Amino acid sequence: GSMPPQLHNGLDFSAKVIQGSLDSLPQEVRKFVEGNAQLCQPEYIHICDGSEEEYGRLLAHMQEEGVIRKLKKYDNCWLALTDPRDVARIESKTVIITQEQRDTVPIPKSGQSQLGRWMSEEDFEKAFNARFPGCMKGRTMYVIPFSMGPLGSPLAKIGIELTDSPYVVASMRIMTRMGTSVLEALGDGEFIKCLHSVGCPLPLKKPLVNNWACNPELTLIAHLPDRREIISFGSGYGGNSLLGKKCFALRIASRLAKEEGWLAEHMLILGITNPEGKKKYLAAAFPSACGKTNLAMMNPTLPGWKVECVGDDIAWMKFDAQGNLRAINPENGFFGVAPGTSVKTNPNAIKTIQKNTIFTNVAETSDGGVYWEGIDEPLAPGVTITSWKNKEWRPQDEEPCAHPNSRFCTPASQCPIIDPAWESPEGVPIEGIIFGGRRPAGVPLVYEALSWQHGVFVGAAMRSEATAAAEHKGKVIMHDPFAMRPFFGYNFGKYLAHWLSMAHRPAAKLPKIFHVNWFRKDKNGKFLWPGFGENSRVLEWMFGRIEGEDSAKLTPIGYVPKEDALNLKGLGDVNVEELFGISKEFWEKEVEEIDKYLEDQVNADLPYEIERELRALKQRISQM
Ligand SMILES: Nc1nc2c(ncn2[C@@H]2O[C@H](COP(=O)(O)OP(=O)(O)OP(=O)(O)O)[C@@H](O)[C@H]2O)c(=O)[nH]1
Ligand SMILES: O=C(O)C(=O)CS(=O)(=O)O
Ligand SMILES: [Mn+2]
Ligand SMILES: [Mn+2]
Ligand code: NA
Structure with missing residues (x-):
């Protein structure tokens, strides 16, 4: 210049x-x-x-x-520890x-x-x-x-x-x-x-x-x-x-x-291939720290299934002239929550982060490696741990070794199942959109929206336990429409109208919309579903539904799997009745809460079609 x-x-x-x-x-x-x-x-x-x-x-x-330390156990990996006042959004x-x-x-x-x-x-x-x-x-x-x-x-x-x-x-x-x-x-x-x-x-x-x-x-x-x-x-x-x-x-x-x-969303994009050699791409909006990265690079437990990752956090999408909804990942790496990451829960992440990776607020082992809650790798006798607070730490202490919002920052190109189309300017064609968050009660493992307009209502109605990704403490169930509550660039009512408008676009091939809950708990606070790789069983059902399989039963909240429709082989101990249960009293309360939230918070900008869906769900629940 x-x-x-x-x-x-x-x-x-x-x-x-x-x-x-x-x-x-x-x-x-x-x-x-x-x-x-x-x-x-x-x-x-x-x-x-x-x-x-x-x-x-x-x-x-x-x-x-x-300002950073080298992690000598790995190839070109580094660790930063922050001031404890600056640990999240x-x-x-x-x-x-x-x-x-x-x-x-x-x-x-x-x-x-x-x-x-x-x-x-x-x-x-x-x-x-x-x-x-x-x-x-x-x-x-x-x-x-x-x-x-x-x-x-x-x-x-x-x-x-x-x-x-x-x-x-x-x-x-x-x-x-x-x-x-x-x-x-x-x-x-x-x-x-x-x-x-x-x-x-x-x-x-x-x-x-x-x-x-x-x-x-x-x-x-x-x-x-x-x-x-x-x-x-x-x-x-x-x-x-x-x-x-x-x-x-x-x-x-x-x-x-x-x-x-077009659309800019808090969504992973993954490609899933079935045992019949067919591949489909899905997008999923879950709130911060509610499972995107772990689903996007899942190692499926079902044999013959393969997942590949296009992006784990942000999707840019638009309908093309052929009417397909095409998605790209605008990022070049993954900025993933570290705690909980292990060979068992996210082995593809474990492989990705062993080189050229920067870690923030995790613990450091005395041999120059990393540690966090849920890492599920015992250390040799004699190896000691420095917590993310730069203090000596033992498994018996009051506090975690890693901050709950500690993160890895890793190149996407290193992921062993990065999708071959992850840098294609044409994007990938999305056939299903998945919503979901942390709901410990009432909300079953998966259901399918009744229509586009119902599916946009389902996104709008999303609620989820607070996490450590921002400043919200405790486990209070918060509204997080489309997993976008922290991220809307403009008036959420207008965003709803924009989503609804896609139904009217030329030749639009609208994806199927689903809602999942990996986080339902029983009376004792234990998870009813094992999640992680086992979520491949839910994706299989979604795949079949996209193909038109007659594997769905109608309920007041949307379609759910027929009895025996889900593959639960190897999970004989799962309580299907509890995980899939829909209670009139729970859902009466739920639709009242959603009604009051949309009235207060969206008010004059609430699209008529979304209010209509609210009235329709209330009606179906009243007929239970
Ligand atoms: N119980 C259970 N926990 C999960 C599941 N998937 C992910 N988690 C855990 O939830 C946390 C958040 O998961 P991520 O996949 O990192 O969440 P994210 O949606 O990518 O979060 P952001 O990067 O913050 O947008 C981690 O501690 C995971 O181990 C699941 O299927 N079941
Ligand atoms: O909070 C999230 O959804 C994240 O993906 C982490 S941050 O990039 O917002 O810090
Ligand atoms: Mn995110
Ligand atoms: Mn993530
Ligand atoms: Na530091």
Whole structure:
């Protein structure tokens, strides 16, 4: 880009560039970098190239500074331990800016929305001015050119993230396609402007905890969709700092998708092949920490079945001219929950994460390996464990060795069952969409929606136990429509109308919609279903239903499997009557709760067809 006009020497940052060239940048990229360098006052500017050399050097530097440790048991794996105040997303500090509050959330009858958080542009400018000026003093501003989707694919969307965190740079290299090639693909094109700071200018005004820079009191993750800007301050963690993922690929993208006729969803995409040599692709929306990654790379227990992974967390979809719903995964890696991961529950993940992987907030064994709750691998006598709090830890202690939201960040290309079509610009054709969450009571193992409009109601009605993925504590059952509650880019009522509208599209081949519950519990709080690989038994039923098999019985909530329709061979001890039971009293209460939630929270923007489905389900339940 060109040198800004100067009367002095205060606007051209060329002298502070320690890698790359402001002259080589597309004009608008340069204006974005330089304007924010003027504001944030970094000491240096490093334009990332995405090279192995760059990555190696940055890791070694974080190592020197004690920001990460090398895990010597594995090939090129690393461990970061965070300040305990910065361990997950914070939904209450995540906001979208629009002219009108109703463009961002429905206006709730109760006065507090549970479907996002809006802030006026005036208020945001005040918040911004209180945070960013001078915030990178003494630090390097890294400039990360990244593509969401394969390099140079016509359906890729490019962003530039400016950050003062090398941990964000390393993680973005895994989770996106990053570097010089992306600048070359971008040329003079438009890009999403992403600005991030950990919010700790040097010299440090506040103590540094665990070598992890963050500013919890001022944390704020903001989205300005008309300006095509994402602006995040104060957290270094995951969805708060890796701006291509939740902030761009769900919140900004879901709004663009509404405008342009596609969908951006909190969905895995998997391909499943049956023993008859037929393959179908399915998408599944489960809430944060409710099973997507474990389903997307499942090792099926049924013989003759194979699952392959296209993506585990975000799907971009659209109906093509032939009417097929085609999906792509915009990410380049998996940012997976670590606890619970074992050879038994997710062996494909175990294989993926043994090299080139960054782990955050897991425990470290004395021989340089990783540990967490549920890892299910005993250690040799003499091997000791350092918890994620950087303290010696024993199996008998009060607290977990790993944070409950600790994560691995691993290249998708390393997954042994990555799908051969995972980088195809044409996407893959989705034949079924699965909704579900954590429901310990009332909701059976699987059912099928009665129609498109009923299936959109089922997504809208989703509820699920809180998890550790954000700030919600305890196990309270929360609404999480479409697994998108933290992630809607715009008014949820309009999103429902957008989903409903797909029924009217030319030649549309609408996928079958299902709802599952892996998490139903008996009287003693034990799971009624073993899950993980055994979920292949439920996918088999869904496969047959997509093919038109007569394996369904009608109930008030939708179709369920006929007696004997599910393959339960090898699971003789499963209580089918309890797992599949539908109780009038439970469901009366459930439809009353959904009615009150939709009335309060969606109100004037609730599509008539969704209200109609609510009345229809209430009626079917009343006839029980
Ligand atoms: N009991 C049971 N637990 C499961 C099942 N699938 C996943 N889990 C556990 O639930 C947790 C979350 O699973 P993930 O697959 O990582 O969740 P996710 O939906 O990918 O979450 P995000 O990456 O946060 O969007 C892990 O601790 C898993 O071991 C299942 O079938 N049964
Ligand atoms: O919370 C989720 O759904 C995640 O996938 C993790 S984060 O990227 O939001 O940190
Ligand atoms: Mn997620
Ligand atoms: Mn996941
Ligand atoms: Na640390």
